[PDB]
């Protein structure tokens, strides 16, 4: 809950500043705040199985309808499984309990579908290096609204992908930063406090208000 509370305080602070009514948006850029991980792809098959996704390192995961999670590392071999009760286990495609067979199969189908048919969000973004403190995160929560899909990762990052104009936000409450991908697929990363200081355009402002609403929802559930 601490990640989301932080993010809520950060966003509330920036938004209360009315950053589009001030402009020096480029002064808010902090190139060292680029995220390590985001969701590059997703498939909502919640009608049947659940939500499959791919992170920018090409690792993949599924959050199944039964609230368990299966994660495949980008080595294409190592698996992490998380029961509904939180119990984690570590396995491989090569060595796994019979009980996981089905889910492993489903994960591979998701992988196929995503690899062949979908483009990568942030294809033009080199992710931050990242070190021993940043292990592979998994999808902790997700939902879709009238306007966007909201993806909350276990490292606290919250990603919001807007349906109409393909614009996207990746918020990190550890770095206190936001990456904005616009309709040109240009991306910039800002320190939220610096956005409080120098302000920003109307589009980013609006999307950060919507983001604050989404974080309140995530905190609410």
């Amino acid at each position: 809950d601490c990640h989301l509370s932080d993010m809520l305080q950060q966003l509330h602070s920036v938004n209360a500043s009315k950053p589009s009514e001030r402009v020096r948006q480029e002064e808010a850029e902090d190139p060292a705040c680029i995220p390590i991980f985001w969701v590059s792809k997703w498939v909502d098959y919640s009608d049947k199985y659940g939500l499959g996704y791919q992170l920018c390192d090409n690792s993949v995961g599924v959050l199944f309808n039964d609230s368990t999670r299966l994660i495949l590392y980008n080595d294409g071999d190592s698996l992490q499984y998380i029961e509904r009760d939180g119990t984690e286990s570590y396995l491989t495609v090569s060595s796994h309990p019979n009980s996981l067979m089905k889910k492993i199969t489903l994960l591979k189908y998701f992988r196929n579908y995503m690899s062949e048919h979908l483009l990568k969000a942030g294809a033009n973004i080199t992710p931050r290096e990242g070190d021993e403190l940043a292990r592979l995160p998994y999808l902790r929560t997700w939902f879709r609204t009238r306007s966007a899909i909201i993806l909350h990762l276990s490292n606290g990052s919250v990603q919001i992908n807007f349906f109409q104009d393909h614009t996207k936000l990746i918020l990190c409450p550890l770095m206190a930063a936001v990456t904005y991908i616009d309709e040109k697929r240009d991306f910039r990363t800002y320190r939220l406090s610096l956005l409080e200081e120098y302000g920003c355009c109307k589009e980013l402002a609006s999307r950060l208000r919507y983001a604050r609403t989404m974080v309140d929802k995530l905190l609410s559930s």
């Binding site: 498939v43 909502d44 979908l118 483009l119 393909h166």
Partner: peptide, 8 residues
């Protein structure tokens, strides 16, 4: 109402 993220 997309089934998935932005396709190729």
């Amino acid at each position: 109402a997309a089934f998935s993220s932005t396709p190729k």
